[PDB]
From a paper:
Hemoglobins (Hbs) from all jawed vertebrates form similar hetero-tetramers, with two *α* and two *β* subunits. Hb is present at enormous concentration within the red blood cell, over 300 mg/mL in the case of humans for example, to facilitate oxygen transport around the body. The change between these two quaternary structures of Hb can be described approximately as a rigid rotation of one *αβ* dimer relative to the other by about 15°, giving a different pattern of hydrogen bond interactions between the subunits. The MWC model explains the cooperative binding of oxygen by low affinity of the T state, which is stabilized by intersubunit bonds that oppose oxygen binding, so that the less contrained R state shows higher ligand affinity and is preferred at higher oxygen saturation.
CO-bound adult human Hb (CO-HbA) shows a mixture of conformations, with the R2 conformation most populated, R strongly represented, and other intermediate states present in sufficient quantity to produce maps. Models of human HbA in both R and R2 conformations are described from the same data-set. The map of class 1 has the highest resolution, and its model has a 22° rotation. The maps for classes 1 and 2 were obtained from 148,562 and 123,614 particles respectively, giving resolution of 2.26 Å and 2.45 Å ([Fig fig1] and [Fig figS1]). The analysis here shows that liganded human HbA in buffered saline solution exists in a variety of conformations, with R2 being the most prevalent. The R and R2 conformations of Hb are characterized by different positions of the penultimate *α*_1_ subunit residue with respect to the *β*_2_ subunit ([Fig fig4] and [Table tblS3]). Arg *α*141 of HbA lies away from Gln *β*_2_39 in the R2 conformation of HbA ([Fig fig4]), but much closer in the R conformation ([Fig fig4]). In the R2 form, the *α*_1_ C-terminal residue Arg *α*141 and Gln *β*_2_39 of HbA move apart so that Arg *α*141 does not form any interactions with the *β* subunit, and the side-chain forms a salt bridge with Asp *α*85 ([Fig fig4]). The interaction between Asp *α*94 and Asn *β*102 side-chains is preserved in both human HbA and HbAM, in the R and R2 conformations ([Fig fig3]).
Residue numbers in the entry:
A (entry chain B), D (entry chain B): 2 to 143
B (entry chain A), C (entry chain A): 1 to 141
Write the structure that this text describes.
């Protein structure tokens, strides 16, 4: 439920996001901050330390595919459920990811954006991204 | 339960907050009211407009309480008993709301102290704020 | 944080469990596997059929751990450190699952010890199991 | 998603539930076990002790209207969202009840049923009521 001004705020800032590094950082921080999420990535190698996770090449590669999907939901912000119907199915029937973890990843992404943008990540900018990440968390919950 | 490294991390990070701590409390309160408007129902008689002086004052008190909890991180239930009396017994604040203010504080620190907000400190700070929240929502008096 | 009355309540209630404790552990494990089938993914090499002897054995060990946590309710992080090593570091059990086994234990006690399962004991037992769950999912070593 | 045998199990047991006492007990126990839920019932008088809550006449009366609604969802188990559309609106726009509290009340009801039925509340009976209470919690979340 974004206003036309919230849609514009969110788009202006996504323009300036490094799409090679932010997804990895977000996924990296999820594995370090909520350590049980690593059980879902046992095929990714060494996740034993924060620096092992943050330098892991498979975490960075996978984080790019996650941020691709957030980018895709920002383009189809009025029809999120559909956009994420195929993906809601992988997380549930094939992977069983409890839906509270989807909200945890959205909140880690909002903090990574705050970390990169500083003063630009104003309270009005954050309030609009909170709407976007809640939308995506709700469309992935099957 | 905080590890010994989690305790070192929290002390060092919050120590870098310093005299900006009330300023960061007020920003976190402003981010929580804008991002999650249902939290305004706990402050019915407050001016909650931008730059409000009652939010600046309340931000300073919340920061001071967190400094005290950092100083007494090994014995937080004793250090925070009056605040647990207010939040859990008098106000009956729902615990969902403590997750929302903790997020807004983490966002405030990430935006102002990036070089300190590493993945390990983020993890330690998230554990510390969850531990403070558990005391404030418990009735153990 | 458990109150002093919460601690009296837990000791008295669990003391009434007595020698039925392994039997109640196994029922709680059986209720959790049937009601919430996703929990079976943590036990891939277990026979999880009704009356299975591996579930009876595991039910007895979970009950024994809870008796030990009741005896050391004031110092649970020290008492439960080996089990926190297994659940949080080795198994990486998601915390949502600790809410599901706590519910199945409460249902097991309500069904077998009704006269003890008063509203005050229910409240104290719910607080104790949430506190045990927090230690088991924390890495504080 | 109840099997024909789960539908029958659940109906057999609801038949034998006291509809004057179980709702009150469930609502009573919610206010005692999750003490912040009392902020929503400040107009109900004395809630200061467990026994004050459990004897409060307004808690018992209100608990009857809650159990009425569970009874109504058991009759329309295939169309829960609709059954609870008007009620999802009171809890959200007029009352703002965070949806985690809906799941907490369903789990307290399952424990009150266990307390009254003992051995009859078998693991197969509980597994079917867990489905029913999850359904009702999901149709009240707006
Ligand atoms: C909340 C937003 C999230 C989005 C947008 C997202 C998106 C994606 C995408 C695009 C893929 C790849 C799908 C494919 O390759 O076909 C994927 C796979 C996966 N996701 Fe997520 N995801 C999210 C949250 C989570 C969470 C919370 C977990 C676990 C805690 C998780 C665990 C996985 C796993 C295990 C895979 C399979 C990856 C592999 O096989 O290597 N995801 N997700
Ligand atoms: C990190 C967590 C929190 C800390 C450390 C904290 C700290 C404080 C402190 C220090 C006070 C004032 C004490 C006094 O003047 O006597 C206070 C009051 C208050 N807090 Fe919190 N708080 C936290 C979370 C919350 C949350 C989540 C809410 C609700 C959404 C909330 C609502 C209130 C209210 C309504 C008051 C009373 C305000 C008044 O009328 O003066 N607090 N808190
Ligand atoms: C009240 C909470 C819990 C207690 C007290 C508890 C206690 C125990 C104990 C005593 C053991 C065995 C220790 C040993 O033999 O060395 C154990 C092992 C285990 N627990 Fe838990 N547990 C709890 C919750 C859970 C939950 C929620 C899950 C997952 C859904 C789980 C999964 C396991 C698994 C997979 C093992 C290892 C089994 C094996 O392969 O032998 N536990 N737990
Ligand atoms: C989960 C299942 C629940 C059901 C089926 C349920 C059902 C109902 C019903 C039938 C009413 C009366 C509506 C009317 O009178 O027109 C009602 C009112 C209400 N419910 Fe619930 N409810 C549930 C959960 C909750 C929860 C979790 C809370 C708060 C923690 C809550 C707080 C209220 C309040 C405040 C009212 C207004 C009562 C009054 O004004 O005195 N309910 N609910």
């Amino acid at each position: 439920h974004l206003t036309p001004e919230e849609k514009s705020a969110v788009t202006a800032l996504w323009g300036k996001v490094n799409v090679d590094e932010v997804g990895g950082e977000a996924l990296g921080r999820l594995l370090v901050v909520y350590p049980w999420t690593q059980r879902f990535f046992e095929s990714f190698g060494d996740l034993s330390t924060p620096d092992a996770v943050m330098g892991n090449p498979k975490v960075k590669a996978h984080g790019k595919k996650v941020l691709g999907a957030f980018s895709d939901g920002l383009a189809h912000l009025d029809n999120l459920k559909g956009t994420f119907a195929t993906l809601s199915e992988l997380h549930c029937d094939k992977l069983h990811v409890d839906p509270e973890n989807f909200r945890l990843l959205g909140n880690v992404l909002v903090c990574v954006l705050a970390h990169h943008f500083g003063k630009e990540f104003t309270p009005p900018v954050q309030a609009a991204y909170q709407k976007v990440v809640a939308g995506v968390a709700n469309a992935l919950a099957h | 339960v905080l590890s010994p490294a989690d305790k070192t991390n929290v002390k060092a990070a919050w120590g870098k907050v310093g005299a900006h701590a009330g300023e960061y409390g007020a920003e976190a309160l402003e981010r929580m009211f804008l991002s999650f408007p249902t939290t305004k129902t706990y402050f019915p008689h407050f001016d909650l407009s931008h730059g409000s002086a009652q939010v600046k004052g309340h931000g300073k008190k919340v920061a001071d309480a967190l400094t005290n909890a950092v100083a007494h991180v090994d014995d937080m239930p004793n250090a925070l008993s009056a605040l647990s009396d207010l939040h859990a017994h008098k106000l009956r604040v729902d615990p969902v709301n403590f997750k929302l203010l903790s997020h807004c504080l983490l966002v405030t620190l990430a935006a102002h102290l990036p070089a300190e907000f590493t993945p390990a400190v983020h993890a330690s700070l998230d554990k510390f704020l969850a531990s403070v929240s558990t005391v404030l929502t418990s009735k153990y008096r």
